Design a protein around this ligand. Structure first.
Ligand SMILES: *[C@@H]1O[C@H](CO)[C@@H](O[C@@H]2O[C@H](CO)[C@@H](O[C@@H]3O[C@H](CO)[C@@H](O)[C@H](O)[C@@H]3O)[C@H](O)[C@H]2NC(C)=O)[C@H](O)[C@H]1NC(C)=O
Ligand SMILES: *[C@@H]1O[C@H](CO)[C@@H](O[C@@H]2O[C@H](CO)[C@@H](O)[C@H](O)[C@H]2NC(C)=O)[C@H](O)[C@H]1NC(C)=O
Ligand SMILES: *[C@@H]1O[C@H](CO)[C@@H](O[C@@H]2O[C@H](CO)[C@@H](O)[C@H](O)[C@H]2NC(C)=O)[C@H](O)[C@H]1NC(C)=O
Ligand SMILES: *[C@@H]1O[C@H](CO)[C@@H](O[C@@H]2O[C@H](CO)[C@@H](O)[C@H](O)[C@H]2NC(C)=O)[C@H](O)[C@H]1NC(C)=O
Ligand SMILES: *[B]([O])([O])[C]1[C][C][C]N1C(=O)[C]1[C][C][C][N]1
Ligand SMILES: *[B]([O])([O])[C]1[C][C][C]N1C(=O)[C]1[C][C][C][N]1
Ligand SMILES: *[C@@H]1O[C@H](CO)[C@@H](O)[C@H](O)[C@H]1NC(C)=O
Ligand SMILES: *[C@@H]1O[C@H](CO)[C@@H](O)[C@H](O)[C@H]1NC(C)=O
Ligand SMILES: *[C@@H]1O[C@H](CO)[C@@H](O)[C@H](O)[C@H]1NC(C)=O
Ligand SMILES: *[C@@H]1O[C@H](CO)[C@@H](O)[C@H](O)[C@H]1NC(C)=O
Ligand SMILES: *[C@@H]1O[C@H](CO)[C@@H](O)[C@H](O)[C@H]1NC(C)=O
Ligand SMILES: *[C@@H]1O[C@H](CO)[C@@H](O)[C@H](O)[C@H]1NC(C)=O
Ligand SMILES: *[C@@H]1O[C@H](CO)[C@@H](O)[C@H](O)[C@H]1NC(C)=O
Ligand SMILES: *[C@@H]1O[C@H](CO)[C@@H](O)[C@H](O)[C@H]1NC(C)=O
Lengths: 728, 728
């Protein structure tokens, strides 16, 4: 026990944190890949059975990265040849295996380079996208029926999102929604025709004699956006000799006026579908409940069935309006919206009415709704011990909003304060995933009596390994800024000697609705800095952050680069007042927004920080995509918010950099925050005669996650830091 | 005390170095720009007379960047809105100014964005290229007649060269040649249709929302090269309602068998032109002398007026074959070719015979021919004192080659060992230009009396300021390697105490036919490193370098990255063994070819150098343009020399980089040595797990010459170099 958590321990993950992944296929049974073989687990008893032996897994092409079984358990889908694209997107090859015949389907296979594929809700239909067009396979071995013909690379998307909807509006590649019983298949169609193209070089493998130019339809603040169309297809008439039967649903008049987005799709019943649209502005979204008319095939909507959500201080929801949770009969629904006091809370809605009733209230927020039986409502919130960085499972009794109980609060009060859950089909069971403050813990529960049932994964192996290495200690706490109570966290080195003055590192994100202060357990770069380098690392959630109410979160509305930056400075000061902090050796580092924030801090000329590192940071908001940017800044026009766009650019503070040591990093293949941003920033600094450091990473993207790149960037930021702090 | 040459001194050019630029315009007169007036000096006596008062430039309203007066002296050409392109190309706006009526022509003006323009050799005709098409204009007040219609950006070039031709064949953008009396206008056409495109990003100004992508047809090793065609236009029939009368001259069959290049054009008489072509391989060139047949308009070529030049030991010429110099009647010409001992001397050719007579011989070389009257032939060679790093003007007698005078050797033996000259028309007078080792001295001479009419400029001023400053000393000497003596130079700090031990910095280029060791006076970065940082900065010309015969020059033929790199390490070793050298602190740096060698050396794992810096280096020969690369390496095919193409890349030595401190720099808008080269090297290094330093420069090209960039890079390099040498 005379060794520490080294840099290599971090980069090689020599300390394995185990998890437990399962899939609910019934209301009490779940699948679990063990020793390379799926097993069916019976939640009620704990007894399992082989659902698919390993061996049967014959490295088809490469490796079986993912599998999905049809709902009737007659077939299982195998995914191989996975080729990542953006953040959620990717292509792959797919095999379908017959669990009856126990053979592999060989006639009529799924196309190579498939973009998205999915079993229908019931039975074993399949819907999939390929070359931006949709295809429906009722039966596996049979042929597939093409549903669209407009698909075109980089221009028209049927069933899958383009770059901006994938990154900022759905957070997923898919834009396909089967009806509850497989009758209808809904999809979105995207048109990127007038969206400008972002282009950059991809050098590829050393042997390529000429670099390639990657081209992506990418709308930057204020530029032409992709347009959208929604379609509902009746798969009943899908026939090789038949036209396709589909109805196009348009947005209510209030959104249809100017530019807009489609932010959500939720089937209520085989004949009732809920669409949620939001305006480009984003301080006005609306739910439109549409019902099928059996006599015309049309899908009708109406005023009685529309619900408008707006914001006067900013944008709707956290990163999009929260999703509606309908009751089985679909006549009412539950959904999180801001308070009269700005706290996110569950309101109960009537499908054909306009008034709603909150069933939760308090100086805390509801993170999300987890399940909804005819009796209870299961959700997750940060109310416990009033700390916003905590997560717990609650169950509220629908006939008495007073009868609210906490299922995770007391299970392991010290080790578990941050949870997420996975409910079984009817909410008879759930798995409780504890991500911290102690080692992660996975357990299974019965909804009937709320009994421990059993433990799925306690990371007892990890714990064993750690008590033979000097780990850092992390403490959460509050500090006061301009009246408001704010949270912070410090990763303190081992053998904490208060008489000693320790160099301090601020690890910062600080983007709207962000939260860098929580109880999640993490084995990170800071672990190594605290443990081995004896550097205290801290984080602060100030104005603009989230899960604390709109007042705090909407604070930076239309003025990014201001309060959240200042607040980091103001808080580091207090941190420097303390005695174990060597106020003459403090740095600040951050990625993406945090790389932006960090850069603004250094150019602030507060003389508080000695140095900082910015990795793939936003430098000028007119360079970032438009869905995100415009949500917090409006349009860059002098008739709107041009002035605050122009003065929140890191380049505007170039001269102050003459006062600190700056390390600038970016991947030449960043498709998210373009390399342009840092190229433009370093050019402004050269032009201001400022000296600094840079580190470009050839062909790496926003995550600089290739193995060698990952190792190298961290190894590099550590040398820069030990030099900024003159450490051995 | 006393002042030392500071970094700022080097960066802001605080110490100016005057010169004397003149434009001969007759056998005894020349133009000079002084105080912004254009004086017309008379060589014979020295008396001058205003030609255009600086009163005119003030009235034009635009910043005159250059001018050109018509040979008949009736008009003057004003250049403005100069926009640099590649190394020699640029576009610009032009105004013609009628001297006589001291008015400015405004009718039938010259197009903005003109790409090249030139007065006829006699009279006041003009020819210029606009949008890759050629235009002739007989009168400044008249309309111009179009000559070509095929002109097309990035595809067809008429009158000017495409990218590779500019950079590697003509070291010029022009591709047109008037005849002596201006009867003909000969031009070359370039077809880049199949030449691949190098593409990269140009971020430009901070306000440009989307980066643009630059595209240039650039042939890389072995790719498809542009094709060429030559035409001679009989400008006598140019009328608005008449066709262009033109004949096309094709190369001799021995060159047409495969890919070739046109590498030279020389008018001999109004009815005789000399074309010089060379096979794509470049160890076979031929000169075709064509005479105009007055009865048909064709230009006839004959086997008797042809002359072949080959190289069995490598390529021909230095960077191309030497141009021929014809007698006034074209019955013979003189030219520089290699003698039997591998030494470049002047051979005298009879236009219609095949054997030639050398008129100079010895273990030194002729640099180039400067002039030729029926009696004498003036030239420059490094014969004097037997040092290839010096140059002198010599005169040899055509009816007796034993009679050769050195017109410059003895004018200032200690101040002047590096000359060049500019002769008046008919070689009657000539300006001599001394570049070192002393301060630059421009004098004027009579070719007959061999008397120095007067000093045009002696930098008497600079010499003053340079006494109140601690300038370093520059020593030149020799050392032996594998049996041959190779020159080297050192810039010793002031108060250089042979006793003490100083850090050594090797400064390298070491490209084929290169010369780093000479006697030219240079106020530089090294002058700062030696003067203020007391660092010795040495250079060495080993195998591969030139001006010392083909054996030394062709030693690296087809094996770039071998002998030259190996010799920069042997020399350093001998240097380390001189006692005033502190082997615990030796470094190496170079730009371009020198960044390559610098990288190859660092990667040799010879443990001699502590650290090194590479600026815009070639890293893999298959990435560099085809003309240059191939000339010394042949084709990258396994049949040809592909095996040496691979073991000579810099990424193949990546492991050895873990033993040294490295700094890789490249300008992202580099169109010569593409940024791809360092992106690939950096990637190979990230992949090897090698730690190193990187610095990109946004939108800077191969020179990284913009005002602020220039400063930033030398500042940045010094800081890095100083920590490596542990200097405070
Ligand atoms: C327009 O042309 C006239 C030429 O007649 C220019 O006048 C000359 O201006 C220069 C500029 O300094 C004077 O030279 C100076 O000489 C002294 C020597 O004592 C030296 O100390 C200075 O450093 C500088 O070199 C020169 O005497 C003067 N000559 C005349 C005839 O007045 C005038 O400057 C031009 N105007 C513009 C806008 O360039
Ligand atoms: C994608 O959107 C573009 C609009 O930018 C559509 O193109 C226009 O289509 C109309 C109707 O055919 C034409 O009259 C216009 O000339 C088109 N303008 C442009 C910019 O091309 C295009 O039809 C849409 N594609 C799909 C499949 O909806
Ligand atoms: C952009 O300009 C605005 C307008 O002045 C800045 O806002 C002011 O910031 C100072 C901070 O010293 C405050 O005292 C004022 O109350 C602010 N006024 C307004 C209009 O809110 C803003 O800070 C600038 N943004 C950046 C990135 O510096
Ligand atoms: C590339 O490979 C060639 C072939 O082996 C190298 O040439 C030999 O190099 C060794 C050691 O440097 C010498 O002792 C031999 O005499 C050389 N013989 C040959 C075949 O030329 C060459 O040095 C290598 N160069 C590079 C760039 O790696
Ligand atoms: B970074 O913070 O991840 C980057 C720049 C700021 C916004 N951003 C994004 O990637 C956003 C936030 C999450 C969806 N896109
Ligand atoms: B650099 O050394 O100037 C670069 C890489 C090697 C070739 N090169 C050039 O710029 C060439 C050499 C001469 C014509 N351009
Ligand atoms: C398959 O499962 C058995 C136990 O059920 C196990 O012993 C065997 O090693 C597994 N094969 C592999 C390596 O996946
Ligand atoms: C567990 O055993 C019960 C009978 O005791 C059976 O009904 C159930 O299907 C089993 N579950 C599995 C898949 O092991
Ligand atoms: C559909 O049309 C195709 C045309 O080739 C035909 O082969 C098929 O029999 C038709 N299906 C029916 C039975 O309607
Ligand atoms: C929504 O934003 C627009 C401009 O961004 C503004 O004109 C409008 O008043 C806003 N509406 C609300 C609810 O504040
Ligand atoms: C220079 O002097 C010569 C001879 O005296 C004379 O012919 C000529 O006109 C003069 N030129 C100038 C500069 O005016
Ligand atoms: C250029 O070359 C292409 C063939 O590569 C040819 O088709 C084209 O006509 C040429 N253009 C001219 C003007 O000769
Ligand atoms: C040239 O042709 C034009 C009409 O095309 C005519 O008006 C003009 O007179 C002609 N000029 C000459 C050169 O005779
Ligand atoms: C010129 O080079 C080629 C290969 O590139 C070679 O075969 C040929 O012999 C060379 N010329 C001579 C005369 O050496």
């Amino acid at each position: 026990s005379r060794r520490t958590y080294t840099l290599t321990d971090y980069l090689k993950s020599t300390f394995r944190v185990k998890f437990y992944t399962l899939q609910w296929i019934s209301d009490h049974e779940y699948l679990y890949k063990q020793e390379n073989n799926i097993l069916l687990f019976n939640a009620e008893y704990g007894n399992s059975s082989i659902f698919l032996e390993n061996s049967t897994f014959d490295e088809l092409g490469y490796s079986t990265n993912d599998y999905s079984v049809s709902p009737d358990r007659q077939f299982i889908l195998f995914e191989y040849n996975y080729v990542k694209q953006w953040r959620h997107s990717y292509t792959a090859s797919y095999d379908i295996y017959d669990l009856n015949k126990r053979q592999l389907i060989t006639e009529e296979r799924i196309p190579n380079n498939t973009q998205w594929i999915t079993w229908s809700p019931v039975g074993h239909k399949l819907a999939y996208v390929w070359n931006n067009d949709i295809y429906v396979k009722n039966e596996p071995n049979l042929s597939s029926q093409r549903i669209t013909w407009t698909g075109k690379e980089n221009v028209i998307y049927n069933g899958v999102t383009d770059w901006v909807y994938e990154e900022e509006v759905f957070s997923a590649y898919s834009a396909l929604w089967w009806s509850p019983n497989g009758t209808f298949l809904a999809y979105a169609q995207f048109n990127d025709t007038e969206v400008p193209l972002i282009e950059y070089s991809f050098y590829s493998d050393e042997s390529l004699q000429y670099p390639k130019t990657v081209r992506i339809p990418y709308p930057k603040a204020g530029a032409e956006n992709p347009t959208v169309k929604f379609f509902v297809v009746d798969t009943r008439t899908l026939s090789p000799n038949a036209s396709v039967t589909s109805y196009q649903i348009v947005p209510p008049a209030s959104v249809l006026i100017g530019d807009h987005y489609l932010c959500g799709v939720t089937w209520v019943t085989e004949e009732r579908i809920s669409l949620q649209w939001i305006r480009r502005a984003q301080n006005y979204s609306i739910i439109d409940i549409c019902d099928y008319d059996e006599s015309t095939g049309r899908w009708i909507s109406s005023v009685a069935r529309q619900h408008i959500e707006i914001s006067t201080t900013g944008w709707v929801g956290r990163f999009r309006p929260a999703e509606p949770h309908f009751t089985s009969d679909g006549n009412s629904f539950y959904k999180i919206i801001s308070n009269e006091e700005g706290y996110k809370h569950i309101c109960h809605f009537q499908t054909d009415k306009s008034n709603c009733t909150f069933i939760t209230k308090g100086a805390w927020e509801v993170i999300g709704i987890e399940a909804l039986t005819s009796d209870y409502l299961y959700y997750i919130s940060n109310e416990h011990k009033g700390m916003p960085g905590g997560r717990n499972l609650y169950r509220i009794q629908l006939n008495d909003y007073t009868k609210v109980t906490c299922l995770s609060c007391e299970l392991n009060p010290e080790r578990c304060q941050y949870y997420s859950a996975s409910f079984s089909n009817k909410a008879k069971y759930y798995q409780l995933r504890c991500f911290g403050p102690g080692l992660p813990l996975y357990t299974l529960h019965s909804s009937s009596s709320d009994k421990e049932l059993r433990v799925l994964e306690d990371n007892s192996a990890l714990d064993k390994m750690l008590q033979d290495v000097q780990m850092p200690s992390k403490k959460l706490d509050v500090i006061n800024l301009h009246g408001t109570k704010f949270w912070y966290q410090m990763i303190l080195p081992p053998h904490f000697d208060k008489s000693k003055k320790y160099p301090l590192l601020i690890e910062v994100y600080a983007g709207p609705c962000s939260q860098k202060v929580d109880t999640v357990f993490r084995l990170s770069w800071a672990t190594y800095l605290a443990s081995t380098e004896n550097i205290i690392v801290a984080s602060f959630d100030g104005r603009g952050s989230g899960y604390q109410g709109d007042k705090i979160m909407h604070a930076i509305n239309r003025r990014l680069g201001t309060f959240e930056v200042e607040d980091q400075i103001e808080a580091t000061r207090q941190f420097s007042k303390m005695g174990f902090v060597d106020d003459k050796r403090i740095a600040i580092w951050g990625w993406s927004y945090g790389g932006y924030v960090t850069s603004m801090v250094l150019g602030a000329g507060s003389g508080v920080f000695k140095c900082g590192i910015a990795v793939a940071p936003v430098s000028k908001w007119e360079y970032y995509d438009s869905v995100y940017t415009e949500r917090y800044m409006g349009l860059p026009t002098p008739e709107d918010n041009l002035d605050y766009y122009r003065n929140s650019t890191v380049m505007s503070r170039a001269e102050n950099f003459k006062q600190v040591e700056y390390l600038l990093i970016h991947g030449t293949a960043d498709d998210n925050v373009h390399f342009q941003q840092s190229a433009q920033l370093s050019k402004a600094l050269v032009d201001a005669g400022v000296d600094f450091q840079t580190m470009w990473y050839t062909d790496e993207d926003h995550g600089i996650a290739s193995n060698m790149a990952h190792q190298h960037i961290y190894t590099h930021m550590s040398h820069f830091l030990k030099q900024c702090f003159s450490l051995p």
